[PDB]
Amino acid sequence: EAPAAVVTGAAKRIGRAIAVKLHQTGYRVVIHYHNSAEAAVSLADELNKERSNTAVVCQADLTNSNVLPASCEEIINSCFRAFGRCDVLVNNASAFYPTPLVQKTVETQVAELIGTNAIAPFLLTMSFAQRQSSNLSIVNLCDAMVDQPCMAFSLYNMGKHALVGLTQSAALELAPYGIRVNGVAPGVSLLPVAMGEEEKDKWRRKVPLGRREASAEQIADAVIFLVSGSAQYITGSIIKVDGGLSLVHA
Amino acid sequence: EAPAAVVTGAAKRIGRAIAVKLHQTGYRVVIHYHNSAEAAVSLADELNKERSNTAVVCQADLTNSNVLPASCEEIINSCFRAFGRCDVLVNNASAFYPTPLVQGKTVETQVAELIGTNAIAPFLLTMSFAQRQSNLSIVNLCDAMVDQPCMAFSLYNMGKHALVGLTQSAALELAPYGIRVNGVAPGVSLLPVAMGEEEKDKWRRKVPLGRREASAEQIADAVIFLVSGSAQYITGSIIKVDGGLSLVHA
Amino acid sequence: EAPAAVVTGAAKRIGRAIAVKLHQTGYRVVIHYHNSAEAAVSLADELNKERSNTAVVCQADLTNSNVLPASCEEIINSCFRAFGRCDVLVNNASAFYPTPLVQGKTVETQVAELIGTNAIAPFLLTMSFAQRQKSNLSIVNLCDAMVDQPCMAFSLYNMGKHALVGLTQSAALELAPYGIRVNGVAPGVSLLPVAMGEEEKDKWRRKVPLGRREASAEQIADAVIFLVSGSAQYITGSIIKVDGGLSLVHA
Amino acid sequence: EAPAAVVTGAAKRIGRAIAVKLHQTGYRVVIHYHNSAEAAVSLADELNKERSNTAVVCQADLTNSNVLPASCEEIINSCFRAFGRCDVLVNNASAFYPTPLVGKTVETQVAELIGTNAIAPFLLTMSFAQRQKSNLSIVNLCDAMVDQPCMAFSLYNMGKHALVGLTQSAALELAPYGIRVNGVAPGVSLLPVAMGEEEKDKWRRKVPLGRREASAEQIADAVIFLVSGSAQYITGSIIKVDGGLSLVHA
Ligand SMILES: NC(=O)C1=CN([C@@H]2O[C@H](COP(=O)(O)OP(=O)(O)OC[C@H]3O[C@@H](n4cnc5c(N)ncnc54)[C@H](OP(=O)(O)O)[C@@H]3O)[C@@H](O)[C@H]2O)C=CC1
Ligand SMILES: NC(=O)C1=CN([C@@H]2O[C@H](COP(=O)(O)OP(=O)(O)OC[C@H]3O[C@@H](n4cnc5c(N)ncnc54)[C@H](OP(=O)(O)O)[C@@H]3O)[C@@H](O)[C@H]2O)C=CC1
Ligand SMILES: NC(=O)C1=CN([C@@H]2O[C@H](COP(=O)(O)OP(=O)(O)OC[C@H]3O[C@@H](n4cnc5c(N)ncnc54)[C@H](OP(=O)(O)O)[C@@H]3O)[C@@H](O)[C@H]2O)C=CC1
Ligand SMILES: NC(=O)C1=CN([C@@H]2O[C@H](COP(=O)(O)OP(=O)(O)OC[C@H]3O[C@@H](n4cnc5c(N)ncnc54)[C@H](OP(=O)(O)O)[C@@H]3O)[C@@H](O)[C@H]2O)C=CC1
Ligand SMILES: Nc1nc2ccc(C(=O)NCCc3cccc(Cl)c3)cc2s1
Ligand SMILES: Nc1nc2ccc(C(=O)NCCc3cccc(Cl)c3)cc2s1
Ligand SMILES: Nc1nc2ccc(C(=O)NCCc3cccc(Cl)c3)cc2s1
Ligand SMILES: Nc1nc2ccc(C(=O)NCCc3cccc(Cl)c3)cc2s1
């Protein structure tokens, strides 16, 4: 038949764009969600209606507990269960909020920010590999502004730095098994829904390429390339998709 | 009207694969060469037979000198003369040889060739490209190993480092003009002309992903992505196409 | 009075050498240890015999847990309790072992120790150090020069060391308005593993361009000493590799 | 007896502070200069007043041309003829001005910005290494902001990137001879004399640590460390001395 992909947090925003675009490219997909049951279902609906029985949903909480392992195993599972194979893993799901050094308790923050951002990708990676001709690859959602961090976002930043480390080490380690591991690093994309609107323009104006944020589909485009046969020799690479934002000094 | 691209050192090896593949994507192509007259003319005949009036050649020495700006201006001008437009510039041409710090070319010539082709020509070509200015982009052929260099290749490495700087500086500067500037960084690809079987397998053995060098087409694939509509928010980015080679410790 | 420093995992190897050199430069020192009780007490004994009332020990597991914040707070408080001040924090303590992806400690346990010691505890200690400030304040984080060219099957260790880089940068940024500098020291190959054979040692030694030998503990401490000194008063968010060229050598 | 150090562009500003700190440390110094003869002599006289026969001056243009190799050989020679040895080389001299891609000629700009910042350091490095017959080191003055460049500084940035490559390449190659090679990367240091205080403050306010530029002495302090017995294992390292400026996003 046709290849299959798991996308994490695929309900909304960047994950949904990735999901749809993988589908259009001919992937059967698992739409993982935590909170967005509705949205997951609706997207599955839309993809199933397009090609019969090619989109399934999956619940899991990706916080750092004692049960993350099983959850990550569950997610990889259902991809094999629904489609009998798993070609692609997109690590998209992610928490993001400030954690000031001079001031949810901390370990909540750690489980979410370190847990979702780093540890869960590590576990999914381990399951994806464990259960493996083909074109297998993993794509991690990184952050182009990792070296010029937002003030008071240490934990978030630590977790994204950790994700670069996983990208590198897993690319090395899984290269023998023909599994590629890559990253996509957005700058400013879909801005926080809560963040002010006139405040949003402030950020848009800093971006060299067209004074605007990346659309979700732009991010998705890079993911598509990395999983494709056009990237068959690409592993351990992180592709920034930031419109030049990371090149701009203070 | 199909867009137009200049590829430097497009007569052989990776440059040829980039020109071919731009052509197969719908571009008209200026094939720059220095010495490889026959291969140059040969390729253009092949492109033109495939689609008449779609390929030209343009001879130029890319060694640094007081007339390199005029030679660079001429390469770009050749594209406007042939095709009435210049949409893409691929900085591919490259001198590569050892320049030990501790002891037939003079050092003046070594600097001219290694710094001229790898860095100064790209800069002058970028300047000419932007001056004569849809989906405009420049792709620089960089080097994935530039922070773990070959022993005794200081001038080469300096040139490739300079090219990274050019990639970033021009991406920043040319963004408001809608011109994107990116790089592709091979690890080990098409291997040298003068090298034994034993030595090839030595290098190949180092590559985590499949224990082999990149095909030129694999390198060309990333160039294709960067110039395409799928990369319209990507600028100042360098994509490693190295099979994990740069991840491998001594 | 004399400034005070907290050094984590300071009973042996690189931490001890850092504690010793800070002590010789006139610091009062907290020697944090986990398991190495005899060795920590021995070191403090030596340092106290050198100038009385200048060295204390402090026991803490730096494995991630819900009590890890309390333990890190307690480490910092030990310094204020002993010496009335805390000028320098060195995050040296580190777990180091393989965690293969394609496969005995549970994975829960691996994550707790490798991410906890190498990254979370540094963050918590960073927080406690800064909050307790109410001179030349700085933090030095022991990083790893080979993080972008890692050992096969050391995913979690590498992830923690990359996190520590992120902490170094983020904390340099956030704490600079308080006058606290935050930097890193990144060894290549230094003191080899106690359980490693001399045969394997020489394999690693011969890869080092500068001298074909590992860094001495002193040489690593030397860089730490520079970063805390007034010769580094404008330096923050910098990581100095002390690796003999090792990270420049290709495969 | 006393070790000897060559410092380039040592007449004024940062190179001056380095010469002085090296002298105070016990070094005999060659004060290289291009135009500031008056400045160079006064420094030399003052140093020589502190300690007889410990300081000499040497004039040379470090621009790129067929005579540059000879010039750099002569600079190194001047240390040996004066002091009988050359233990340290500090590549400090630098040209810095904008070179927009869109009243000097372009070839002149290339010659000056690539010549002073990259090529002359390479030639000096070669001459330093070849003339050796303990604690030998080279320190290259880099730039902490090379990945977040000033707009329209492409050539400057290319030169500073090249210098990073030299540092790394020469570190690797000279390590067997026991010559360490490292860099110091200032952020904002001595601001131009004639720059308005109101402008100066715009840059000053960007700096996290103390909201001021680095003194020349602070930069020199990092140089002193790298040449010292405390840095005996450090090679191929670049120490940013930037007060956190490079960590600050747009
Ligand atoms: N937005 C931007 O501008 C930038 C984004 N990025 C990165 O790109 C990726 C996508 O960003 P964006 O779409 O804005 O992300 P969001 O912050 O909106 O989160 C995306 C999804 O993550 C899931 N998620 C969050 N926390 C958990 C958790 N504890 N367990 C399980 N799932 C969880 C949610 O799924 P559910 O809805 O089902 O609960 C949510 O829809 C992230 O990795 C992010 O860090 C990086 C830099 C810039
Ligand atoms: N091959 C590999 O494994 C790797 C290559 N790269 C990079 O990828 C790109 C393509 O590599 P590859 O195809 O191997 O390159 P080649 O070594 O085959 O050279 C490409 C072309 O550069 C041209 N060139 C050389 N000197 C001059 C000069 N003075 N003036 C004008 N043109 C000149 C030549 O044109 P002509 O033949 O007409 O004289 C030559 O065919 C380069 O920029 C290279 O640095 C990066 C790392 C790995
Ligand atoms: N040695 C080398 O070659 C290199 C070292 N580094 C870094 O340099 C630093 C020093 O290296 P090195 O001296 O070899 O380190 P070690 O591996 O010897 O560990 C130092 C100390 O870490 C402490 N530690 C370990 N696990 C825990 C834990 N769960 N809770 C609390 N403390 C713990 C131990 O204290 P105790 O003995 O009391 O149990 C130990 O003595 C480390 O951060 C390391 O990663 C970087 C690269 C190379
Ligand atoms: N100051 C700052 O904020 C920053 C500086 N840096 C780097 O720090 C180093 C020192 O900085 P700074 O003191 O401000 O530098 P300056 O701009 O003051 O230049 C230092 C010296 O360079 C010499 N020089 C310039 N062009 C030439 C040439 N063609 N031939 C020979 N010598 C030449 C001059 O010698 P003379 O006067 O005798 O002609 C000059 O005094 C440089 O390498 C610089 O790039 C990096 C980032 C920031
Ligand atoms: N899960 C999520 N992770 C992230 C990470 C980053 C952002 C984000 O909005 N980043 C922008 C940082 C930035 C920094 C400086 C200038 C600008 Cl215009 C933008 C948003 C999100 S949402
Ligand atoms: N114009 C050209 N530029 C370059 C640059 C690099 C190479 C090359 O062969 N690079 C491989 C270097 C290498 C470094 C370490 C391990 C391995 Cl297997 C290979 C070949 C060329 S040809
Ligand atoms: N807590 C500890 N952390 C670390 C981290 C790294 C090392 C170490 O020995 N790293 C060497 C890795 C290496 C990789 C490639 C070549 C070589 Cl000569 C050495 C040893 C330790 S002990
Ligand atoms: N030879 C010389 N090289 C350089 C390099 C850089 C500078 C300089 O002024 N750099 C500051 C760049 C900068 C960029 C963005 C913000 C801020 Cl406050 C400062 C000044 C000089 S003088």
Author numbering:
A (entry chain C): 2 to 104, 114 to 142, 151 to 268
B (entry chain D): 2 to 104, 113 to 142, 152 to 268
C (entry chain A): 2 to 104, 113 to 143, 152 to 268
D (entry chain B): 2 to 103, 113 to 143, 152 to 268
The authors write:
Pteridine reductase 1 (PTR1) is a folate pathway enzyme essential for pathogenic trypanosomatids and a promising drug target for diseases such as sleeping sickness and leishmaniasis. For the Leishmania species, this requires inhibiting both dihydrofolate reductase (DHFR) and the trypanosomatid-specific enzyme pteridine reductase 1 (PTR1), whereas for T. brucei, PTR1 (TbPTR1) was shown to be essential for parasite survival and therefore its inhibition alone should be sufficient. We determined the crystal structures of five TbPTR1–NADP­(H)–inhibitor complexes with compounds 1a, 2b, 2c, 2d, and 2e to resolutions ranging from 1.58 to 1.85 Å. In all complexes, the crystal asymmetric unit includes a whole TbPTR1 tetramer, whose structure is highly similar to the previously reported models. ,,,, The 2-aminobenzothiazole moiety of all compounds adopted exactly the same binding mode in the current crystal structures, as was observed in the previously published structures and in most docking results in this work.
In the complexes with 2b and 2d, the linker is in the trans configuration, with its amide oxygen pointing toward the substrate loop, and the tail phenyl ring is located inside subpocket C. In this orientation, the meta-halogen on the phenyl moiety (either a chlorine in 2b or a bromine in 2d) forms a halogen bond with the backbone carbonyl of Trp221, similarly to I. Indeed, in the complexes with compounds 2b and 2d, targeting subpocket C, we observe a slight rotation of the indole moiety of Trp221 by 25–37° with respect to the conformation in the complexes with compound tails occupying subpocket D. Therefore, the conformational change in Trp221 appears to be associated with the presence of substituents in subpocket C of TbPTR1. Furthermore, the compounds with tails residing in subpocket C, bind similarly to the reference compound I, and form a halogen bond with the backbone carbonyl oxygen of Trp221, but the orientation of the phenyl ring is not the same as in I (the conformation and position of 2d is virtually the same as for 2b, not shown). Moreover, the E MED interaction energies suggest that positioning of the substituted phenyl moieties as in the crystal structures of 2b and 2d with TbPTR1 is more energetically favorable than their I-derived configuration. Thus, the conformationally adaptable tails of 2b and 2d seem to be more optimally positioned in terms of halogenated phenyl interactions with subpocket C of TbPTR1 than the corresponding moiety of I. This observation could be exploited in a further fragment-based compound design. All compounds of series 2 also show rather low activities against T. brucei mostly in the range 27–39%, with the exception of the moderately active 2b (51%).
